[PDB]
Write a protein that binds this ligand. Structure first.
Ligand SMILES: CC[C@H](O)[C@@H](C)[C@H]1O[C@@H]1C[C@@](C)(O)/C=C/C=C(\C)[C@H]1OC(=O)C[C@H](O)CC[C@@](C)(O)[C@@H](OC(C)=O)/C=C/[C@@H]1C
Ligand SMILES: [Zn+2]
Ligand SMILES: [Zn+2]
Ligand SMILES: [Zn+2]
Lengths: 861, 66, 91, 842
C-alpha cells in the first residue's frame, strides 16, 4: 500500500546528440543537445568563452536522431526529432518565451525503439526541401517541406522508400544543389545470407552505397544508383555541392576513408594514419567515432576523430567538377566524443561519450603547420599505412569544461565529513577519465578525485570512514604490463643506428592516459586495481595492483567472529574472463587484513573457486559469497577461506546479495530476486521464495523485512513484497510486484535515506546517464488524489514534446503501478496561462496554489 | 500478418524465431542510450565501435540455418 | 467484402457524416473520441474529398479513433477508410 | 468475366461483344483488342480486377507501343459522358504507361497535347490538376527538347488563346523538369526581336511559372526577373503590361522573401507610373503593390511616399478594375512596417473615405468584400476609433446595403480591437446608429445581429445607460408578425445576457424571462428554439432562486416540449432542462424528473451528435439530482421487457447512472438480475456490464473483485454468446483500469478467459482476442508471453496456429518490450542463441 512520487534532483549530464545552428534566429549560434530523454538549448558566450544552459525540457521519450534544417531565404533553424514514438516532430525555439514550440508532429508507426518502424536515422536535404526518417530495417519515409503565404513551415504526406531484407548503417542527404533531392544510404541485404545454410552468402555479401532520388516533378522516390563496397563502412559525411563544392559523399570505414560520387567520378580512397609506436593490439582496426563540417564562402574542411581520440582535419583537392585527392592532417587529441560542432568565431564544442564535456577556442587551423600532411596521392603497397606521433594540444585552447556525472556506476549517501547532513559519494567516469566525486547541495556542488580504471564497487570502513574502491577495465594493460610492453617494443625496434636515441626518447615519453587514451589491447585482458581513498582529501592511502588477467568485481570490508575485532577486506576476482562468447577460468578471493586504522592493506591469502565471485556480503561474523550460480557462507581460515554452507539451486548467476536478519535476497542476472533462508541450527541454505517475472536486476535495496526495491537493466524500477507472515520452512512462495515504473535511464544505485536531516525518508537512485532521482512516499491520500489528477491533466493538456504517450512511456516494459511522475507535474509552470487557469479551476483552486503545492512537495524531500 | 517482420506461423522454425528476436534486441540496443552505454562500459570500447560491431553481427546473429 | 484501405496515411483528416458523427472507424464505439483520423492521399482525392470515412456519405465533422484504440495504438495501422471490393467507382 | 457496359461505353468497346474468340482470326490487331479489354477492365470493375488490369497494361506497355495505346485512350478522355472518377483512373493509367515507355511517346506528343490542353483551363479544379499531371509525365517521358520542338511554333500564333494555353503548358513543363532547364529557352524567347508575341508569351510563361510554383521559385527568382525585366520598357504596350503582371506574380509567390532580387525593376516601375495610364498603369500599380511588403521599413517609407500621389489620384478612376487594384495596393501598403499610421491618417484616409465609401460600392459583391476587408485591415494600424468615427453617422442611411456594409465593418473592427479606443461621442452615435439600423431593416439577416451583439459585448459595463432603450426595442420586436424578427430578438438576448448581467439589470431580464415563458407556446420551430436559448441564457445569468418564472413553474412547461421533432428545439430544450437539473434541481419533484427521464431515453437515439450529447449530460444531471434507486429499478425492468432496438438506450442510461452515482449503487442490482434462470436477461445484463465498464473507465478500478464471480460463471457458461459478451466485458475492464494496479484481479480473470481460445465461431474468437489484447495492455506483455511460450512450439498443429496468432498480436503490440522478456534459449552445436550482452555485470 505504498504510493511514490518521482522527482529528478540532478538531470542527466551525458550527451548523446548535439547540433549547432541559429535557433534564436539572430547572430548568436546556439547548440541543442539530446541527453537521454531530455532536450537542452545552450548558448556559448563568445566573449567569456563559457557555455550557458538556456533551456531544459523533459520529453518523456527516447531521442534516436537529432537534426537541424533551414529553408531557402530563412533566418532561423528548425529542429527535427526522431524518437521512440511512431511520430516525427519539427520544433522551433521561441526566444520570446524560452520554449520549444512544436511546429509539426506527423504519425507513421507504432511506439518503441522498433526494428522496422522509422525513427533511428534522420537525413535532410541540404537546402531544406525534404527530410527522410529511416528505420534500421526495410522502411524509410520522405517528407516534403515548404512554406506558405505567411512564411509558416508546412509538411506533406510521407513518400514510401521501402526495400525488404535491407539493413541501414547510416543515411545522409547529398548536396545536389537545387536538382532533385537525393539521399545516400549505407545498406546491406540479408535475404541471400538467410536462405543459404553453408555461410557462403553471409561471407560474400557486402555493404552497398545506394542513392534514393526524390523526383519532385513526378513526386515519388526511386532507388536509382547502388554500388557495392570492398570495405565495410560505418558512416557517411555529406560534402558541399552545387555552387560551393563538388557533390558527393565521404564513406568512413575500418582503416580507410573513401570519397565516392555518382557518375564518372573515380572512387578516391585513403588509409587512416595510425599512431607512432602504438601500444594497442596490432590486429585491431581503426574507425572514426564522429565527424564535423565547417563551411566558409572560400573553403571548407572536415574534422574526424578516431577511436584513439585523435582529431584529423580533412580537405578535398578540387579540379573543377572532379576531385583529385583526399588530404588529412593531425589536428589534436581530445577525449573520445559522440558529437563535435565547429561554430563561427573560432570555437569547437566537444560532447564526450562519457565524462565531462569541453569547449575550446581555435587558435590556429594547422595550415601553417610544419607537421606533415598526408594525401591519397602518396603511393604505397603491402598495406603499410601513414604514421604520426600524437602531441599535446596547441591548435586548441581549453576555454570551458562542463561537469558530467555520466556514467554513474556506484553511489553511496553518507555524512562522512561531520557536516551533520549527508553527501553523495559517486564512483563514475570511464577509463582513465574515471572519477570518485563528492556531491553536496544547498542542483549539486561536486568535487572530483581522478581514478585509474573504471570503478565497479566501493565499501566504507565504519571506524575509519575511508573508501575501499575497486577499479576494473576490459582489454587494458596493467602498469607492469604496459612497462614490459614498452620495453619489448623498444628492444624490438632497434633491430634493423640512431634507434638507441629514438628508443630512449620513446620510453621517456609517458603521455597521460587521461587525454591520449589508455593503451588498450587484447580480447580477454583485464586491468584491475584496489585502492583506499580518504573521502575528504583526494589522496589515496594505499593501492594494490593485480595480475594481467585478474579482474575485480566485488568488494566488502567486515570483521569475523572467528578472530578478534580486527578488520578484513575481501575482493572477488575473475580470471581470463571472455565477454562474448562468455567463458572463464575461475575466480579468486583475496583476503587483506586492513591494518593501521584503515590505511594499509595487508595480504593474507588468496582462495580459488569455480567461477567469478560476483558478490560479497558480511553476515554475522561470516561472509556470504556468490560464485556463479552458487551461494556460499565462508569463514576466515588461516590458510584459505573454508566453505561452511552452500546452495546450488540458483537459476543462472548471482549478481548481488543483501541480508536482513537471517533472510538472504539474491539477485539473478535474469530471473529477478530469490529469497533464501539460513537456518542457523541445521546449517543449511533453503530457497523459499522467488518472483513471477524475470528482471535483469542491476541493484537492489531492502525496504523492510518483506519488501525489496530493485532496478532494471532496461531503465525500470520495481518494488516487490512477500505475502504476510510467509513461513521460511515452506517453499514455492511467490512475491507480488507492488510497484512498477520506467525511469527512462538505467539505474545502477538505489538507496533508502533522508537527504536533509529530520525531513522525509525517501528512495534516491542514480542513473547510467548521470542523473540523480528520488521517490518519496505520500503522507496522506488527499495529496495522492490531488497529484493523480494533476498527472492525468498534464498528460491530456501538455503531451510529451516528441509525440510519445506519457502513460505508455512510463509503462515501457510493465504497466506503471503506484508511481506519480513529478517531472511531468512540475511542467505546470511552463504551460500557457489559459490552460493553467483551466486545469487549476478543474482542481478547484488557483494556479499559485498548485505551484505552491509542487514547491512544498519538492522542499519536503 | 505477412507485411510485419517478426511474426510467425505454425511452420516457424526455432532458428527463424531466434534470429528475429536477436535482431530485435540489437536494434533495441542501438535505440536505448543507456543500454548501449552499459555495453560500452562492460567492454572497454567506444560507442561507435560497439554500434559497428552490432551492425556487423546483424547479418548472421545466431549462425547459418539447417 | 469490406476492408480497410490500410495504405500509408498522410496529412488529410478523415471526415464523418451526421449518422456516424460520434463513432469510431475501427470498433464502432461512441465512447471517448481521442485522436484525429488521418487518411491516405488516394482516399481523399477527387469527389472523395470530405466524404464520410465509414459509410461514404457527406461529411459534416472530423473523424476520431476512440481512446481504447489509441491505448492499443490501433491508430497506427494505416488509412482506415473502408473500401468495398464489389463496387466500381461509378456505383 | 466481362464487366457491365453503360450506353456511352458501347461506342468504345463494342468489338468485345463479338464472339469470334479465336486469335488466329485476328490480323495481328489482337493488340487493339487486348488494349480494349484491359481498358474496359480498368474503367469499369471492382478494385481487384482494375488493379490486375492496370498491372497487366503497365507490364506490357512497351510491348504494345504508345501508338495504339494512346489512340484508344485519348478518345475516352475527351468523351463528354466521362465521370470524374473514370477520368482519374484514365489519368493514372496514362502516367503509369508514360513512366514505362520513355521515348516511345516522342512522335505522338503533339497528337496528345492538343487533346489534353483544354483540361488546363477547365472549370473543374481536379481536371486542371490532372491535365498538369499528364503534361508533367509527358515532359518527363519525352525529352525536354521534344517538348520544346513540339510547342515552339505556337508561341507567336496570332490568336491569343492558343498562346495562353501553350504558355501555361510551358509553365507545367518547367515545373516538371526544373526552372533551369527552360531558363536559356525563356531568356532567348523574352528577347526575341522578330515577333513581339514571342516575348509576350515568354513573360506570360514566367508569370504562370510563378503562379503555379509559389514559393518554390525563390532560388531562381533573380534569374527570372533578370530574364523578364527588359520587357517593362518595351515599346509594345501589351508586353510591358504582361511583364508588370509577371513581376506581380513573382513577388506574390516569393512573399515575404527576396526583395533584393527586385532591385532592378524598382526604378522602371517608378518611372512608368508617371509615364503610363490605363490597363498598363493598373498592371504597374499591382506589381508595386505586391512588391512593397517585401521592402525594408525605410525604403518602404520612401517608395510608398513616391507612389502615393499617383495611387490616390487613381482613387477616382472610372474603370472599376483600376479601383479594385488601387484598393488592394493601399491595403498592401498600410499592412507593412515603415509606413506609420500618422502618415496614413494624414494623407490616405480622407480621399479613401471620399471616393471609396459611397453607396455605389454597396451593390457589387467583390467590391463590397474588398472594401470591407481593406478598411478592417486599416483599423489594425491606424486605430479603431479613428476609422469608426468616419463612417458611424452613415449607419442611419436609408440605403440598406450601405448601412449593412458599414455595420459589418464596425462589427469586425470592434471584434478585432475591442472598445477601449472609443470615447463618449463615438459611443453614443454607435448606439444610436445600431438602434436605427436594427429597427429599420427589411430583411432579417445576421449582419445586424452580429454587429449589435459584438458592439454591446465590446462596450461591456459601458452599456448600462442604453440598456432600457435596447430592451424596449427587443420587447417591441418580440411582438412582431414575422417569425424571423422575434427569432433575431431572442438571439440578441442570448448573446447579450452576460453583459446585461454585469450591468446588474436583473428586474428587466426577469421581465424578459417572463415574456419568453409566455411565448414558449410558439408554433414555428426555429424561433421556438431561439426563444428557448434566450430563456437558457437568462436562467444562466440570474440564479435559480430569483428566476421569474420560478423553476417550479418553468420546468413542467418544458417537459412536453421534449416530444417536438425539430432538432433545434430538441437541442435547446434539452440544454435548458439540463442546466435546471444541474443547479435548480431542488425545485421540482422526483416524478417530474422521472417523466423527463422517460422522454429522454428516446432522444439518446437522435442522429445529430449534439442532441445526444446534451441528452447524456442532462440525464446524468437529473440522475445525480434524484435517487439512483428508482430510475435504476425502472431501467432494469425496462431491460427485461425491451427488445434489442431500445435496449441500448437503457444500457447507456444504466452506465450513466453508475457513473454519476458511483457503480456500487448500480452493480448489486444489475448482478442480482443475473441470477434469474432465463438466459436472455442474463445476456442483457452482460451487455450492460460491458458498456458500463467501457463507459466508466478508471472508475471501475474498485469493482473488478465485485463482478469477478459473475464473469467466472459466464466464461464457462457453455453458451457462446455469454462467453463472447463476458470476454468483451473483461476487455473493456482491462482497458479502463490500465495503470491503476488491478493486475492481480485481471490476471485471475485471464485464467477463465484463456481456455476459450480454442473456439471456432468467428465472433466469439475475435471477442476472446480483443480480451487478450486488453489484458496485454493492462497486465503487461511479459505475462502474455509467459502464457504463449508453453504452446508456441507443440506437436499439435492447431494449437500452434492459435498460439502463433496470439503471439503475433502481442508482438505487433509490444515488440520493443519483449526484448526484456524472451526466455533464455541455450546454444547447441549448430548455432548460438545466448544474448551474451545482457549477461554483462558491471
Ligand atoms: C452500446 C454502445 C453502442 O455504441 C451504442 C451507444 C450505439 O447504438 C447507439 C447508436 C446511437 C445513435 O444511439 C448512439 C448513441 C451514442 C451516445 C449517446 C454517445 O454519445 C455520443 O455519441 C455523443 C458524443 O459524441 C460524446 C458524448 C460524451 C462525451 O458524453 C460520451 O461520454 C463518454 C464518457 O464517452 C457519451 C457517449 C454516448 C454513449
Ligand atoms: Zn475504436
Ligand atoms: Zn486510403
Ligand atoms: Zn457515415
Amino acid at each position: 500500500h505504498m504510493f511514490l512520487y518521482n522527482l529528478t534532483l540532478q538531470r542527466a549530464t551525458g550527451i548523446s546528440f548535439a547540433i549547432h545552428g541559429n535557433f534564436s534566429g539572430t547572430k548568436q549560434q546556439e547548440i541543442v543537445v539530446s541527453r537521454g530523454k531530455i532536450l537542452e538549448l545552450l548558448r556559448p558566450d563568445p566573449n567569456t568563452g563559457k557555455v550557458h544552459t538556456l533551456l531544459t525540457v523533459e520529453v518523456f521519450g527516447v531521442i534516436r536522431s537529432l537534426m537541424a534544417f533551414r529553408l531557402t531565404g530563412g533566418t532561423k533553424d528548425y529542429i527535427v526529432v526522431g524518437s521512440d514514438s511512431g511520430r516525427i516532430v519539427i520544433l522551433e525555439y521561441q526566444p520570446s518565451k524560452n520554449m520549444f514550440e512544436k511546429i509539426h508532429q506527423e504519425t507513421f508507426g507504432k511506439s518503441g525503439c522498433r526494428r522496422i518502424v522509422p525513427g533511428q536515422f534522420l537525413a535532410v536535404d541540404p537546402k531544406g526541401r525534404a527530410v527522410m526518417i529511416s528505420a534500421i530495417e526495410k522502411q524509410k519515409l520522405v517528407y516534403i517541406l515548404n512554406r506558405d503565404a505567411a512564411a509558416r513551415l508546412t509538411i506533406s504526406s510521407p513518400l514510401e522508400a521501402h526495400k525488404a531484407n535491407t539493413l541501414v548503417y547510416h543515411v545522409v542527404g547529398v548536396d545536389v544543389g537545387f536538382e532533385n533531392p537525393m539521399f545516400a544510404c549505407l545498406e546491406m541485404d540479408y535475404e541471400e545470407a538467410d536462405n543459404d545454410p553453408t555461410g557462403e552468402a553471409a561471407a560474400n555479401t557486402q555493404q552497398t552505397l545506394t542513392f534514393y532520388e526524390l523526383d519532385l516533378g513526378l513526386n515519388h522516390v526511386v532507388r536509382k544508383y547502388s554500388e557495392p563496397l570492398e570495405e565495410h563502412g560505418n558512416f557517411l559525411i555529406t560534402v558541399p555541392g552545387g555552387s560551393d563544392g563538388p557533390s558527393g559523399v565521404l564513406i568512413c570505414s575500418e582503416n580507410y576513408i573513401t570519397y565516392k560520387n555518382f557518375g564518372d567520378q573515380p572512387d578516391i580512397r585513403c588509409p587512416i594514419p595510425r599512431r607512432r609506436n602504438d601500444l594497442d593490439d596490432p590486429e585491431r582496426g581503426m574507425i572514426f567515432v564522429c565527424s564535423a563540417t565547417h563551411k566558409t564562402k572560400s573553403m571548407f574542411f572536415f574534422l574526424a576523430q578516431t577511436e584513439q581520440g585523435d582529431i584529423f582535419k580533412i580537405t578535398l583537392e578540387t579540379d573543377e567538377d572532379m576531385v583529385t585527392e583526399i588530404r588529412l592532417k593531425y589536428f589534436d587529441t581530445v577525449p573520445v566524443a559522440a558529437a563535435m560542432c565547429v561554430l563561427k568565431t573560432g570555437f569547437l564544442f566537444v560532447a564526450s561519450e562519457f565524462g565531462n564535456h569541453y569547449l575550446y577556442q581555435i587558435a590556429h587551423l594547422g595550415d601553417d603547420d610544419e607537421e606533415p600532411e598526408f594525401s591519397s596521392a602518396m603511393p604505397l603497397e603491402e598495406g603499410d599505412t601513414f604514421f604520426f606521433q600524437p602531441r599535446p594540444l596547441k591548435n586548441l585552447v581549453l576555454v570551458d569544461e562542463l561537469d558530467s556525472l555520466s556514467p554513474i556506476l556506484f553511489c553511496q549517501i553518507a555524512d562522512l565529513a561531520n557536516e551533520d547532513t549527508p553527501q553523495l559519494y559517486v564512483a563514475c567516469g570511464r577509463g582513465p577519465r574515471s572519477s570518485l566525486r563528492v556531491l553536496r547541495h544547498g542542483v549539486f556542488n561536486q568535487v572530483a578525485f581522478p581514478l585509474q580504471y573504471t570503478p565497479r564497487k566501493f565499501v566504507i570502513h565504519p571506524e575509519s570512514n575511508n573508501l575501499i574502491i575497486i577499479e576494473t577495465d576490459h582489454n587494458a594493460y596493467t602498469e607492469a604490463t604496459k612497462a614490459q610492453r614498452k620495453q619489448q617494443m623498444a628492444e624490438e625496434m632497434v633491430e634493423a643506428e640512431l634507434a638507441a636515441e629514438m628508443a630512449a626518447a620513446f620510453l621517456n615519453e609517458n603521455l597521460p592516459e587521461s587525454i591520449f587514451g589508455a593503451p588498450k589491447a587484447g580480447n580477454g585482458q583485464w586491468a584491475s586495481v584496489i585502492r583506499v581513498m580518504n573521502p575528504i582529501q583526494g589522496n589515496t592511502l594505499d593501492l594494490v595492483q593485480l595480475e594481467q588477467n585478474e579482474a575485480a568485481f566485488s568488494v566488502a570490508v567486515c570483521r569475523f567472529s572467528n578472530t578478534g575485532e580486527d578488520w578484513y577486506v575481501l575482493v572477488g576476482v575473475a580470471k581470463d574472463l571472455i565477454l562474448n562468447p562468455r567463458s572463464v577460468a575461475g575466480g579468486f578471493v583475496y583476503t587483506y587484513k586492513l591494518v593501521n586504522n584503515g590505511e594499509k592493506l595487508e595480504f593474507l591469502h588468496k582462495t580459488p573457486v569455480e567461477e567469478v565471485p560476483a558478490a560479497i556480503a558480511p553476515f554475522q561474523g561470516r561472509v556470504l559469497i556468490g560464485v556463479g550460480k552458487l551461494l556460499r557462507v565462508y569463514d576466515l581460515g588461516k590458510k584459505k577461506l573454508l566453505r561452511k554452507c552452500e546452495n546450488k539451486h540458483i537459476a543462472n548467476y548471482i549478481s548481488g546479495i543483501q541480508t536482513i536478519g537471517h533472510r538472504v535476497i539474491v539477485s539473478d542476472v535474469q530471473e529477478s530476486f530469490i529469497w533464501v533462508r539460513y537456518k542457523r541450527n541445521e546449517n543449511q541454505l533453503i530457497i523459499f521464495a522467488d518472483d513471477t517475472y524475470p528482471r535483469w536486476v542491476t541493484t537492489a535495496s531492502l525496504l523492510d523485512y518483506d519488501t525489496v526495491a530493485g532496478a532494471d537493466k532496461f531503465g525500470n524500477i520495481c518494488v516487490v513484497r512477500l505475502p504476510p507472515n510467509t513461513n521460511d520452512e515452506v517453499d514455492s512462495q511467490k512475491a507480488e510486484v507492488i510497484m512498477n515504473y520506467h525511469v527512462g535511464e538505467t539505474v545502477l544505485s538505489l538507496q533508502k535515506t533522508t537527504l536533509i536531516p529530520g525531513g522525509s525518508e525517501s528512495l534516491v537512485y542514480t542513473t547510467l546517464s548521470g542523473g540523480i532521482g528520488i521517490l518519496v512516499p505520500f503522507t496522506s491520500h488527499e495529496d495522492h488524489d490531488f497529484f493523480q489528477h494533476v498527472e492525468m491533466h498534464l498528460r491530456s493538456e501538455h503531451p510529451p514534446l516528441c509525440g510519445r504517450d506519457h502513460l505508455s512511456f512510463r509503462s515501457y516494459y510493465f504497466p506503471v503501478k503506484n508511481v506519480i511522475d513529478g517531472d511531468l507535474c512540475e511542467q505546470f509552470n511552463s504551460m500557457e496561462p489559459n490552460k493553467q487557469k483551466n486545469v487549476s479551476e478543474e482542481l478547484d483552486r488557483t494556479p499559485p496554489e498548485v505551484s505552491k503545492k509542487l514547491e512544498d512537495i519538492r522542499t519536503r524531500y | 500478418q505477412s507485411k510485419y517482420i517478426g511474426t510467425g506461423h505454425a511452420d516457424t522454425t526455432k532458428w527463424e524465431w531466434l534470429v528475429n528476436q536477436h535482431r530485435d534486441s540489437y536494434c533495441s540496443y542501438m535505440g536505448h542510450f543507456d543500454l548501449l552505454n552499459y555495453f560500452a562500459i562492460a567492454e572497454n570500447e567506444s560507442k561507435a565501435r560497439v554500434r559497428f560491431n552490432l551492425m556487423e553481427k546483424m547479418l548472421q546473429p545466431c549462425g547459418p540455418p539447417a | 467484402d469490406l476492408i480497410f484501405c490500410r495504405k500509408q496515411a498522410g496529412v488529410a483528416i478523415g471526415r464523418l457524416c451526421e449518422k456516424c458523427d460520434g463513432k469510431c472507424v475501427i470498433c464502432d464505439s461512441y465512447v471517448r473520441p481521442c485522436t484525429l483520423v488521418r487518411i491516405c492521399d488516394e482516399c481523399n482525392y477527387g469527389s472523395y474529398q470530405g466524404r464520410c470515412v465509414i459509410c461514404g456519405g457527406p461529411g459534416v465533422s472530423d473523424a476520431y479513433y476512440c481512446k481504447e484504440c489509441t491505448i492499443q495504438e490501433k491508430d497506427r495501422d494505416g488509412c482506415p477508410k473502408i473500401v468495398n471490393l464489389g463496387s466500381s467507382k461509378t456505383d | 468475366n466481362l464487366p457491365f457496359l453503360k450506353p456511352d461505353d458501347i461506342q468504345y468497346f463494342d468489338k468485345l461483344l463479338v464472339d469470334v474468340d479465336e486469335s488466329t482470326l485476328s490480323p495481328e490487331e489482337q493488340k487493339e483488342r487486348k488494349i480494349m479489354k484491359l481498358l474496359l477492365k480498368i474503367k469499369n470493375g471492382t478494385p481487384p480486377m482494375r488493379k490486375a488490369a492496370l498491372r497487366q497494361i503497365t507490364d506490357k506497355a512497351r510491348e504494345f507501343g504508345a501508338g495504339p495505346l494512346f489512340n484508344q485512350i485519348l478518345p475516352l478522355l475527351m468523351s463528354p459522358t466521362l465521370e470524374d472518377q473514370e477520368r482519374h483512373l484514365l489519368v493514372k493509367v496514362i502516367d503509369r504507361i508514360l513512366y514505362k515507355l520513355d521515348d516511345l511517346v516522342r512522335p505522338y506528343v503533339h497528337k496528345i497535347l492538343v487533346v489534353i490542353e483544354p483540361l488546363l483551363i477547365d472549370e473543374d479544379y481536379y481536371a486542371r490538376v490532372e491535365g498538369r499531371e499528364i503534361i508533367s509525365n509527358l515532359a518527363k517521358a519525352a525529352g525536354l527538347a521534344t517538348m520544346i520542338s513540339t510547342m515552339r511554333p505556337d508561341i507567336d500564333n496570332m490568336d491569343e488563346y492558343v498562346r495562353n494555353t501553350t504558355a501555361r503548358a510551358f509553365a507545367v513543363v518547367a515545373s516538371a523538369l526544373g526552372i533551369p532547364s527552360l531558363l536559356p529557352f525563356l531568356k532567348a524567347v523574352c528577347k526575341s526581336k522578330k515577333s513581339w508575341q514571342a516575348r509576350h508569351t515568354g513573360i506570360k510563361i514566367v508569370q504562370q511559372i510563378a503562379i503555379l510554383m509559389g514559393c518554390a521559385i525563390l532560388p531562381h527568382l533573380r534569374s527570372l526577373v533578370e530574364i523578364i525585366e527588359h520587357g517593362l520598357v518595351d515599346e509594345q504596350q501589351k508586353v510591358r503590361t504582361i511583364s508588370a503582371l509577371a513581376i506581380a506574380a513573382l513577388a506574390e509567390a516569393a512573399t515575404p522573401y527576396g526583395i533584393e532580387s527586385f532591385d532592378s525593376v524598382l526604378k522602371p516601375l517608378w518611372k512608368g507610373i508617371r509615364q503610363h495610364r490605363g490597363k498598363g498603369l493598373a498592371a504597374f500599380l499591382k506589381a508595386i503593390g505586391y512588391l512593397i511588403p517585401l521592402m525594408d521599413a525605410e525604403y518602404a517609407n520612401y517608395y510608398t511616399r513616391e507612389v502615393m500621389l499617383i495611387l490616390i489620384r487613381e482613387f477616382q478612376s472610372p474603370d472599376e478594375e483600376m479601383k479594385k487594384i488601387v484598393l488592394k495596393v493601399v491595403k498592401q501598403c498600410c499592412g507593412t512596417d515603415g509606413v506609420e499610421a500618422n502618415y496614413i491618417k494624414t494623407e490616405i484616409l480622407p480621399p479613401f473615405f471620399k471616393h471609396f465609401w459611397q453607396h455605389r460600392m454597396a451593390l457589387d459583391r467583390r467590391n463590397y468584400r474588398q472594401l470591407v476587408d481593406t478598411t478592417v485591415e486599416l483599423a489594425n494600424k491606424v486605430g479603431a476609433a479613428e476609422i469608426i468615427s468616419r463612417i458611424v453617422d452613415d449607419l442611419k442611411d436609408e440605403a440598406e446595403q450601405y448601412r449593412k456594409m458599414v455595420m459589418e465593418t464596425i462589427e469586425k473592427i470592434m471584434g478585432n480591437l475591442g472598445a477601449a479606443d472609443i470615447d463618449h461621442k463615438l459611443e453614443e452615435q454607435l448606439i444610436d446608429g445600431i438602434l436605427y439600423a436594427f429597427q429599420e431593416q427589411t430583411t432579417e439577416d445576421s449582419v445586424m445581429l452580429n454587429g449589435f451583439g459584438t458592439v454591446v459585448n465590446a462596450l461591456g459595463k459601458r452599456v448600462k445607460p442604453y440598456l432600457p432603450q435596447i430592451c424596449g426595442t427587443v420587447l417591441w420586436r418580440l411582438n412582431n408578425k414575422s417569425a424571423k424578427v422575434r427569432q433575431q430578438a431572442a438571439d440578441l438576448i442570448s448573446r447579450t445576457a452576460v453583459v446585461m448581467k454585469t450591468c446588474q439589470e436583473e428586474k428587466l431580464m426577469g421581465h424578459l424571462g417572463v415574456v419568453l415563458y409566455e411565448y414558449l407556446g410558439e408554433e414555428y420551430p426555429e424561433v421556438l428554439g431561439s426563444i428557448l436559448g434566450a430563456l437558457k441564457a437568462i436562467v444562466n445569468v440570474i440564479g435559480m432562486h430569483k428566476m421569474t418564472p420560478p423553476i417550479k413553474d418553468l420546468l413542467p412547461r418544458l417537459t412536453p416540449i421534449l416530444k417536438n421533432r425539430h432538432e433545434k428545439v430538441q437541442e435547446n430544450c434539452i440544454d435548458l432542462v439540463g442546466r435546471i437539473a444541474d443547479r435548480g434541481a431542488e425545485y421540482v419533484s422526483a416524478r417530474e424528473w422521472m417523466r423527463i427521464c422517460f422522454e429522454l431515453l428516446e432522444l439518446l437515439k437522435a442522429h445529430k451528435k449534439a442532441i445526444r450529447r446534451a441528452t447524456v449530460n442532462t440525464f446524468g444531471y437529473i440522475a445525480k439530482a434524484i435517487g439512483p434507486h428508482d430510475v435504476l429499478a425502472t431501467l432494469l425492468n425496462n431491460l427485461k421487457v425491451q427488445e434489442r432496438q431500445n435496449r441500448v438506450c437503457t444500457t447507456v442510461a444504466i452506465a450513466i447512472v453508475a457513473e454519476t452515482c458511483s457503480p456500487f449503487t448500480v452493480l448489486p442490482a444489475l448482478m442480482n438480475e443475473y441470477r434469474v434462470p432465463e438466459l436472455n436477461v442474463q445476456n442483457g445484463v452482460l451487455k450492460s456490464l460491458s458498456f458500463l465498464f467501457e463507459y466508466i473507465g478508471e472508475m471501475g478500478k474498485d469493482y473488478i473483485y465485485a463482478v469477478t464471480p459473475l464473469l467466472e460463471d459466464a466464461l464457462m457458461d457453455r453458451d457462446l454468446v455469454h462467453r463472447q459478451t463476458a470476454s468483451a466485458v473483461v476487455q473493456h475492464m482491462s482497458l479502463g483500469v490500465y495503470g491503476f494496479g488491478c493486475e492481480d484481479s485481471l490476471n485471475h480473470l485471464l485464467n477463465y478467459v484463456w481456455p476459450n481460445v480454442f473456439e471456432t465461431s468467428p465472433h466469439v474468437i475475435q471477442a476472446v482476442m480483443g480480451a487478450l489484447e486488453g489484458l496485454r495492455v493492462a497486465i503487461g506483455p511479459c505475462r502474455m508471453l509467459q502464457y504463449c511460450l508453453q504452446g508456441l512450439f507443440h506437436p499439435a498443429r492447431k494449437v500452434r496456429d492459435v498460439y502463433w496468432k496470439i503471439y503475433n498480436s502481442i508482438y505487433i503490440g509490444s515488440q520493443d518490450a519483449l526484448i526484456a522478456h524472451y526466455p533464455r534459449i541455450y546454444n547447441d552445436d549448430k548455432n548460438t542463441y545466448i544474448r551474451y550482452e545482457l549477461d554483462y555485470i558491471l
